[model samples]
Target chain A: EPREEAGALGPAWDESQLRSYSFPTRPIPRLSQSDPRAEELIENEEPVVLTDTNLVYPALKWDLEYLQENIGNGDFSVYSASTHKFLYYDEKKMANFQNFKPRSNREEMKFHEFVEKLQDIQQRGGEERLYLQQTLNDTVGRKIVMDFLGFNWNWINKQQGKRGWGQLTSNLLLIGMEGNVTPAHYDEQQNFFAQIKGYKRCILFPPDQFECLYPYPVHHPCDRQSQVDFDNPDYERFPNFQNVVGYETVVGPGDVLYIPMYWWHHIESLLNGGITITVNFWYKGAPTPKRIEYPLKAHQKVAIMRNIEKMLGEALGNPQEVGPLLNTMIKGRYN
Target chain B: EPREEAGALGPAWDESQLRSYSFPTRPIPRLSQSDPRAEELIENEEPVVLTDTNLVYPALKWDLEYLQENIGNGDFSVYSASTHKFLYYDEKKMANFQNFKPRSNREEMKFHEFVEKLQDIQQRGGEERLYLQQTLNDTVGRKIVMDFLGFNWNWINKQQGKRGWGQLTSNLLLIGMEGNVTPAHYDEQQNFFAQIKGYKRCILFPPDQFECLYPYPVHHPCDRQSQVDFDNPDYERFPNFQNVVGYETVVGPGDVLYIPMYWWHHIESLLNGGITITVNFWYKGAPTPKRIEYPLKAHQKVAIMRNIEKMLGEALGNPQEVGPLLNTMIKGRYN
Candidate 1:
């Protein structure tokens, strides 16, 4: 019955192929953003699959043909990978990936050129994979922007207004060829990820498992990303990963997933699928209230930990000493 | 040697008298709020015994005799317990304690009268225990408030400013007769507990132990307090208490303990010791940052759990159904 709703795709992938961790067998709850339940659920900060509404319905018309006609004017940043892997680049830092040599190659191409090259790679059967990531702006054509403007902003603003959250920050358009994967990473903002085409399997972990994820130092470019490769994780380097548990779901066209602040997610496009397209709306959450809510939450404690690390690194002037000093203070007392 | 610093009281009690949990054999680290290490340690949020500071040094003259001579004019709110236990009262709730009925007996009397009645209970060898708890207001003698203003504000302000914390909310003056105990509870504000005249033993647990502590509903006046009695805990009713681990320390004259927000603490005056005098500085903490840092901490997850409970309670319009609804969402899915 589920596959019948989306006639073309049978299933994203076999459940057995999911090796990261076991997920909640039940489908994620779906509710409209305008439903009375939405405000309460969002305030609680729990992620949910929001559907049964026209929140991002305007984007449903965005197929390759529709996109090419409406967005051909946009210059898209495309990453070409010799293999399936597309390691993230730290755009903020001029340095290479992980501050070392570059991993995947990248280029800037017009949307039509990018799509043509993408189709050529699939037909010719080369290892090269192409992905288009662009921010929706004027360059994406007035027609595209005109359509984007119809995305029920009033309803979204009303939902956001109730929580006292900050304004919308950015809208990122991600176009991935079949089998393309974005490595596991955590972002600093709340996200509303809407899938416009094909399918993506999303794997997520709660924020309490910071140790298991082994994020890089804040000073590093990959500050919020895991060091271990999920496909062939070096268990020796990250023994804690064995203890990690995850929740996952396959999102298809016309689906919206609320990604709460600080959750770690790994995303992939189904291998045999044609193309996967997604657009995410990022926002800043409300400031923590001055009136103390008794019992600080897990993410806040992680923030406290981050503050400790930054402060210690600044005070000691050496990251090496931060661990020893904290060990001296807590090793015997805390355990 | 430790006792020689004050040249008066010996050990507060033999080590055998300490019971709720095992304490570190070595004392907790003592650091000044202005010390470079303070920023780092405070960021980590582990409790530290701060000494060699002038923040509240003027309070050294707050012995029973000195207090009686200087602050006798203050009308103190005293709680008299039939036994050694003294539960907390929420004067802010327009309704009675727990929003229903008063749990403990309370009275208002002159500071000297409360002190005299405390001494009378000790001499007569009765079960009654008296505690004098009053806010450091102008009513507590203009001279006392004037002396209080002499505290090192510049130093405290610098500490708060550096952390981006909220303004100081309150300063409470407490005088506890021998054997009086404040039952275990957590507060929503950051606290600076300073010992002025006598020794008091403080037992603490991190906020992650909410399940173990079994806090009452948020609507209850005993909102953030443990439902289980520490002295005679009902193991069958609170099996999670068996998993709890605690940290304890005996604070004496001239010592200041930084109680991080949401930490549960149980305080008691030494059984045979005379009147104990203490003052606590409470302040609101900074708001949760709009941009999240990844991998949330345990306390934050607890906050999420609270929000979920409240939301479900509201949606269902029956608190009892909240449990079942959460079980449906997470029972088998999240272990």
Candidate 2:
């Protein structure tokens, strides 16, 4: 209750919940759906906080206890960590990051069991943190099913078509403990993230900052995630990190934020802001341009460089050898 | 007159002027301003040919003889080269590119004298080629000034504001003998190029293609010009150039092409098409983002990387050391 509002008109949530990072950032603009520019920003592949959208109006009532009793009858994917950060890694790529240990472990659990674990974490006060990332499915309870069914599909579908976005791939239901963080990572889908309950602070960077937020090698387990620790970045290792610029926003219930494809984002449940509930409608990006335009988009260059790295990696047959090879190329004669 | 039109419907000029390059490319889209998408394309920082606009409608009659007679410029900057290519370079930065001889030399000459040399080169043919590049001023002939004054200022000024571009800057009138080439280079200002006389082909690459284009070092005389000789690319030396994608279009009289700032472009008068006449308005770019948005524009990353290179170059005091320094940074500790 002592927390301050992120804005003049929001249900109060404080910046105190957010982790202090050395990287500088500005706030993401908040706009109502009634404003034409709100949609224009999304269409231009920039992030915007959309207010007055009924994408998940009924889901605003979701809470841990209520969800345990009526939202799900099946297991959800839950990841746990000894610390507040939940750094996701791909199991299949573990061999690429030899000797690396994952920061979290994933397990499937019933909604009630997850709620119980969440309660224990809140009450017992250890470093324990839990995050549930599950795709909406038929296994959910009838109440949740009805509430999900009542979502604003017509409006969402209309917006999707208007932007020429690809198919509606999946809707991820994310529930995280207070103070828990989803470390900086990029997803390949366009997302409309609706906050159903509680508050979460998000920090985002454009794809061009790839150098600043050094991603792990493509062959590694933590490929899409940032290599730098946000709170305590290894400045010596990533000096460019000092120049990274991020955009921040606090999303409360009824707020929808557009997360453009390939944009890096790190998010956290507000400290002491209670458990947070959010559902994201992720869509595949628009089809690749038939005739690519001049001044390619920053994300498009990300794809270009990604291909270059992979191609170079295959030729070198070792990531260790790739760096020296590039150095040799741009050494004296080229630049 | 015997040359083929670049398109089926145009007053024809053949692609015979185009040199074969190993790099792959696509065509820049051509649209009419009446469609509204033309302005949107410009606003989006992509190159487009606005066919229907009257930006330079009256100047369409600007033939070599008409320009020679009515263009009352006291003296224009004339560049001569033994070869057809006219590569612009900085005189002050010549020390930065030691042992590198410029392909052309610049001289100041009256319009009549410049035309005499042009005629001499045409009548008594050797490799001698000439290009006139001069800013519009009060010395121009009275008729030419009236035509210049009749330009669509209201439309141009309207479009400028709609895009938040900075200033008008100077308009440069360009006169090039047939087959004269302006090799691949980038400008810091946005350009609206109007083709008044003969046809010219433009090849463009997005700023993101800096790697593929292989720009000369920042301190070099030819800093903004690409090192890769398009017609004779050395793939062994610049392998990434093999992966570069270019967008190209041919502009005939009455066509206004938007050349977004920082986009790399190569332009040439169609071979055997006789003399060509043109003028361009170069404007400063839109204001930098107050709160720079995510997925920064490709050109913005260009600026960011430029600053990095400059800062690093300053510390090292030598371009030779900067590459190795970067190589050291990303050698093994980083991906």
User: Which candidate achieves the best DockQ against the true structure?
Assistant: 2
What is the alpha-carbon lDDT for the whole of candidate 1? 0.71
lDDT of 1 by residue, B1-335 (tens): 13344466555456544444322333456676567686687777767777755777778887777777788476788887777788775656424233366556789888778768877876898777778888877666565766788787887787788777798998888988777788888887888888887878887888877767777654445666777788887777676788777766777777788888888888999777777888998989888889656455655545544554455455454554444433322211111
Instruction: Evaluate residue B156 in candidate 1 and report its C-alpha lDDT on the 0 to 100 scale.
Output: 75
| C-alpha RMSD of each candidate structure in angstroms | 12.6, 19.1
Cα displacement (angstroms), candidate 1, residue A72, comes to 4.8
Summarize candidate 2's per-residue lDDT along A196-293 as a digit string, tens digits: 88888889999877778888766678878888898898888888888899998988889999999999999989899888899999999889978757
Superpose all Cα atoms of candidate 1 onto the true structure and report the RMSD in Å to 1 decimal. 12.6
lDDT of each: 0.71, 0.81
Clashing pairs in 2: A206-B295, B5-B12, B5-B13, B72-B141
Stretch of 10 with least lDDT, candidate 1 chain B: B326-335
CAPRI docking class of candidate 2:
incorrect
